Swiss-Prot record, chains A, C:
Effect ascribed to mutating D85V: In Inkster; O(2) affinity up
Residues modified to N6-succinyllysine: K7, K11, K16, K40
Organism of origin: Homo sapiens
The keyword Iron appears for this protein: yes
One annotated Gene Ontology cellular component of this protein: extracellular space
Stated name of the protein: Hemoglobin subunit alpha
UniProtKB/Swiss-Prot annotation, chains B, D:
Known outcome of mutating A140V: In Puttelange; polycythemia; O(2) affinity up
Effect in UniProt of substituting H2Q: In Okayama; O(2) affinity up
Gene: HBB
Protein name as catalogued: Hemoglobin subunit beta
Alphabetized UniProt keyword annotations: Acetylation, Congenital dyserythropoietic anemia, Disease variant, Glycation, Glycoprotein, Heme, Hereditary hemolytic anemia, Hypotensive agent, Iron, Metal-binding, Oxygen transport, Phosphoprotein, Pyruvate, S-nitrosylation, Transport, Vasoactive
Native organism: Homo sapiens
Phenotype upon changing W37S: In Hirose; O(2) affinity up
Annotated consequence of substituting T123I: In Villejuif; asymptomatic variant
Effect listed in the UniProt record for changing E101G: In Alberta; O(2) affinity up
Length: 141, 146, 141, 146
């Protein structure tokens, strides 16, 4: 469960991301594809090379979903219900892969927001991304 | 584990800039803060009540220094990690009974600390090289389990 | 999330356990200790040998908690809140270990209830134990 | 992986009673039912819409038979699982890109199927021996990743 302090930390850190939201999402995807090549197979219709407009566009989508989760942090199962159906049913994303993308999102935030990425905020962000991942893996059928 | 020459280059070049007195303690401290069940193995370290307490704890900084030393040793023997980590494997697996998932977690926390310290210099291809390394170290440390 | 069919399957399978509830819990613990020796360190004040009265007693406790979860399956976070505090805060149980005990509970049920352990019911029981595990690991601080 | 003689005995004695035409299909079918994301790798197998559809699918039964064959082969070479599973590792890791966590899951589903089939004969010490085996097989199949 996310504590009051966790929610405060996550909202504050994500607030600093700003107009870089889509950019950071795209970078996290790139980090995941390079670090954990098994994840690439979900995107055969994507060119996954650096500077790919498809990865850029997709990063924005991912970021917008995380922003939705932040904005509705006390109601995340409802807010992410459609996305849960998509990832679990249609795409059949292996639950391990959410841990991989979550780690790459943390690395991206650490690399861009050194002042915000305190140990306490790192812990809050990890709990938040684990909560998001729990919702997105909740619909396997 | 096999790194390309380009990856070896990226890894060794960055590691030469690492503050070996601090980065290990930062990684171990963050492990204790982010994954609080790991504190089970460090009751003798004293005050771990708050993140500030953990990060400022002299015992956490001192032990982190030895862990980093072990990672440094692994970087020098990337083609023989099993032999390099044999005694540490017996300690962590046979004596301490740490679940090996936590070896992976500490490696990933180290990667976060490197990203924090190096910023844009910690590029996605540099990270990918370091992920091969910390996976190799985790697997070698877990050898006594398998 | 547990579906209506999942809840029906779990209630039916657990209904067949009966007065063997405590016994099956004790057997699952024994399976876990023998199969995954890292888990033994949580019980230094226990004799973990076969026929141990402490493992027997503890198995009953575990079973009673699972029965509570079955009886309150739509309100499990509330029903298991005290147990969540215990395992995460005081005992600091590594989350991996819940997957290990869940697997040993499935093996125990399979070994004792061959008619009930259909593929559908196996799937429902796995989802149920994963849900229980999610609650019991929800309070790390 | 190292089994005691007592464990080797327990493992080989039970395996001789295994129905080699059915148990593999039961394990693969249950993997597909219990962990539905694994169906991603078997789109060519046809009807997987219901558990009954999965378990009755002739392609699931036929493939399960080969998997069991691989486990049988592993039981004959417990001290050289890496060599035994080398080609399968290249297939599952380099060609298929299956996450290795799923190797562990299938092994644990097999253990459940053995428990189902053998009942009280699948004692806790027999299970513990089989857990060493399926962990060994999973680690060997994942060698191309590490
Ligand atoms: C924090 C975790 C994640 C978030 C917030 C997220 C968010 C999203 C969003 C917003 C979309 C687009 C939805 C739409 O257009 O209708 C999407 C699609 C998709 N996601 Fe994710 N996702 C996450 C994790 C993952 C992971 C771990 C994988 C696989 C490794 C994955 C694979 C995909 C794929 C394959 C698509 C469809 C792309 C396409 O066909 O165009 N996602 N995700
Ligand atoms: C890649 C991962 C790891 C590395 C490289 C590593 C390295 C080390 C090193 C170098 C030592 C000092 C041994 C000595 O004094 O000779 C040590 C001790 C220790 N480690 Fe780690 N470690 C890792 C993961 C972990 C984790 C995840 C835990 C617990 C959650 C842990 C628990 C301990 C404990 C309790 C000791 C003290 C043992 C003693 O003094 O008797 N280690 N480790
Ligand atoms: C389905 C999962 C689990 C359930 C339902 C469960 C249930 C329980 C219950 C009912 C108690 C007694 C509470 C009390 O007396 O106040 C307990 C205590 C305990 N549990 Fe669990 N537990 C689970 C998983 C685990 C796991 C995976 C571990 C460690 C590997 C663990 C370690 C312990 C320990 C060490 C105690 C305290 C024993 C003592 O000091 O007497 N539990 N659990
Ligand atoms: C211990 C675990 C496993 C064993 C022993 C095993 C064994 C095998 C064997 C013997 C084959 C036949 C290869 C051939 O025809 O020469 C095969 C093929 C295959 N496996 Fe597995 N497997 C395991 C886990 C998995 C998992 C978890 C997945 C997916 C979730 C998977 C996906 C596949 C696929 C898609 C094929 C067909 C490949 C092809 O025909 O080109 N395997 N495996």
């Amino acid at each position: 469960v996310l504590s009051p302090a966790d929610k405060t930390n996550v909202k504050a850190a994500w607030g600093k991301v700003g107009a870089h939201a889509g950019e950071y999402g795209a970078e996290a995807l790139e980090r995941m594809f390079l670090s954990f090549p098994t994840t690439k197979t979900y995107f055969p219709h994507f060119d996954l090379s650096h500077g790919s407009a498809q990865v850029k566009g997709h990063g924005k989508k991912v970021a917008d979903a995380l922003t939705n989760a932040v904005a509705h942090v006390d109601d995340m199962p409802n807010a992410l219900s459609a996305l849960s159906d998509l990832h679990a049913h249609k795409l059949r994303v292996d639950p391990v892969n959410f841990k991989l993308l979550s780690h790459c999102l943390l690395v991206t935030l650490a690399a861009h927001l050194p002042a915000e990425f305190t140990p306490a905020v790192h812990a809050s962000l990890d709990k938040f991304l684990a909560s998001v991942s729990t919702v997105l893996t909740s619909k396997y059928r | 584990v096999h790194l390309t020459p380009k990856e070896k280059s990226a890894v060794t070049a960055l590691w030469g800039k690492v503050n070996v007195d601090e980065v290990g303690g930062e990684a171990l401290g963050r492990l204790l803060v982010v994954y609080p069940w790991t504190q089970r193995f460090f009751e003798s370290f004293g005050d771990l009540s708050t993140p500030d307490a953990v990060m400022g704890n002299p015992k956490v900084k001192a032990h982190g220094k030895k862990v980093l030393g072990a990672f440094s040793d692994g970087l020098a023997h990337l083609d023989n990690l099993k032999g390099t980590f044999a005694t540490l494997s017996e300690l962590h697996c046979d004596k301490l009974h740490v679940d090996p998932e936590n070896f992976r977690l500490l490696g990933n926390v180290l990667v976060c600390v490197l990203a924090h310290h190096f910023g844009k210099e910690f590029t996605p291809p540099v990270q990918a090289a370091y992920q091969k390394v910390v996976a190799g170290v985790a697997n070698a440390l877990a050898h006594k389990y398998h």
